[PDB]
Design a binder for this molecule. Structure first.
Ligand code: NW5
Length: 236
């Protein structure tokens, strides 16, 4: 996250850190708890991943330094990538991880609801992007989970900033005209969480963009509401 601030314990309890364990253990991407055995994340995170065997999902983490040799984590039973996925910029950048066991919900780990059925006309004005990603180019994964409030921009405006790409209604964009706040490497797969009537909803999945926090280059997110039929079918 560029231009964000440190989160505190229990602030974003649906946020998880997905680690790969070979050839080193490192944070790969973010994700969101959406059910007791289900993480919603970005398909592009799994490029070159030979199987779910090398993944670990950590929930209830604020600082990456908390993760030690005895820190509990969930194994991944299955990676479900959208059948239309090809590359992040084309869309369909969405994946489910089915965990090997259930997540017990606490103040530090609990699910986020998807955008509600019937809320098409809701205008989201309080959206936040979170993660352990870079705070600038050529950075490293951050220790403390960062947060930034980012305004949604219309798909029409987003398309004008990305004339070389097809911005579809399966994507949503968010960013400031002058840049300064955005997601960056290591944030993909995590949530774009929006609060409406004091309830958080998972409106976007961090997916792609040109650089990080550049002026007139908003972040592009998977528009979760357009995948509810797919999510529900896979998690039923
Ligand atoms: C820093 C650099 C090189 C630039 N520009 C760069 C590299 C990568 C590559 O990351 C991965 C590759 C394979 C697998 C997994 C990842 C990790 C990942 O996607 O988070 C990603 C982003 C980036 C991520 C999110 C984002 C934006 C850019 C937009 N600002 C809006 O949201 C930027």
């Amino acid at each position: 996250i560029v231009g964000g601030t440190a989160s505190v314990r229990g602030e974003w309890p649906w946020q998880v850190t997905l680690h790969t364990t070979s050839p080193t253990q490192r944070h790969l991407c973010g994700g969101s708890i959406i059910g007791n055995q289900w993480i919603l994340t970005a398909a592009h995170c799994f490029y070159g991943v030979e199987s779910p065997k090398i993944l670990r999902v950590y929930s209830g983490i604020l600082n990456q330094s908390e993760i030690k040799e005895d820190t509990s984590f969930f194994g991944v039973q299955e990676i479900i990538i959208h059948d239309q996925y090809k590359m992040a910029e084309s869309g369909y950048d969405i994946a489910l991880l089915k965990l090997e066991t259930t997540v017990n919900y606490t103040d530090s780990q609990r699910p986020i609801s998807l955008p509600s059925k019937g809320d098409r006309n809701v205008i989201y004005t309080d959206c936040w992007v979170t993660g352990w990603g870079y705070r600038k180019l050529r950075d490293k994964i951050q220790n403390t989970l960062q947060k930034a409030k980012i305004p949604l921009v219309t798909n029409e405006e987003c398309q004008k900033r990305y004339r070389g790409h097809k911005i579809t209604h399966k994507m949503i964009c968010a960013g400031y005209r002058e840049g300064g706040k955005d997601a960056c490497k290591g944030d993909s797969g995590g949530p774009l969480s929006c609060k409406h009537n004091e309830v958080w909803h998972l409106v976007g999945i961090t997916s792609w963009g040109e650089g990080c926090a550049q002026r007139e280059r908003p972040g592009v997110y998977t528009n979760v509401v357009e995948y509810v039929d797919w999510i529900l079918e896979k998690t039923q």
